[PDB]
Design a protein around this ligand. Structure first.
Ligand code: NA
Lengths: 177, 182
């Protein structure tokens, strides 16, 4: 059974590493963002990526890979902080729609800029090839049970100083003293 | 002009997005498999069992889990209320604690570990050993982006009785998808 033991060990270690990595990346992302948590940020972004009419708890839950119950708690938190407004859905009386407010959008402009520095730092050791490989393997793991990911104008909004700072942080161009 | 930078940023955004939503799904799915613990509870108890008894401080457990002291304090308080751990003073520092897994905590972990093996088979059934080595390696690389490397569970490597042999047989059959038969 040595082949089986070695496969199991490798699976255990890959799982444990996924879990502790996401813990670390969550904590680190919260420090970068500063004014939102990573979970708040990703929930607002998920809402911005849906059509207003389709911003239901179920659709938001599917986009985030999580349960309706978790999105319900997150959305109530966003509403009490004044980041979203929650109205009844016009298609279904049991469902909701979520609109991002002016405050929400303001905080997202600030967090997106910081987000660009965070991506630069997190992936500075990766080639483009290795990122594509990582992304591909994470998508394969997603569909282990038969159900596939629902992933994520926008280009024109990124200003040239952000991309300049991104290039410098990613490439470690600076000759350190 | 910044087309290359935009491309790289987009790809990093998608990888991060996919990582986040994947671990959300794996957590919910792991909760369903284990049944009598959540995944977080399970991994916290396992982190405690990989540390020496005297070095089961909040800080050391946090470091093993890749999270904060405050998050471990809440997890450990939830485990204590459930009867899975006892919390006692650290003998080496008056401020610090130690955490001991109770007999009820050990029994629940034996049940969850067995289920754990079937979960691993299912989650990774499409992966070759080589893909797993590649994924693991790339996850370790991302971990150390800030200069701090992972403090992992790799000391698991360094007696197969009948019960273990049956668990390993079920593992191989699940992994190789001998059902979808009819
Ligand atoms: Na974004």
């Amino acid at each position: 059974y040595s082949n089986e033991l070695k496969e199991l060990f490798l699976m255990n270690q890959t799982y444990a590493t996924l879990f502790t990595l996401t813990n670390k990346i969550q904590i680190e992302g919260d420090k970068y963002f500063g004014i939102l948590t990573s979970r708040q940020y990703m929930t607002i972004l998920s809402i911005l990526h849906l059509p207003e009419e389709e911003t239901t708890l179920n659709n938001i839950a599917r986009k985030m890979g999580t349960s309706k119950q978790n999105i319900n708690r997150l959305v109530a938190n966003l509403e009490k902080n004044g980041y979203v407004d929650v109205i009844p859905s016009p298609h279904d009386k049991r469902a909701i729609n979520v609109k991002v407010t002016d405050l929400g959008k303001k905080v997202m402009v600030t967090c997106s800029r910081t987000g660009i520095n965070f991506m630069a730092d997190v992936f500075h050791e990766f080639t483009k090839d290795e990122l594509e490989t990582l992304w591909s393997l994470l998508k394969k793991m997603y569909r282990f049970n038969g159900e596939e990911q629902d992933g994520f104008e926008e280009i024109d909004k990124i200003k040239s100083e952000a991309l300049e700072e991104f290039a410098k942080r990613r490439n470690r161009v600076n000759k350190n003293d």
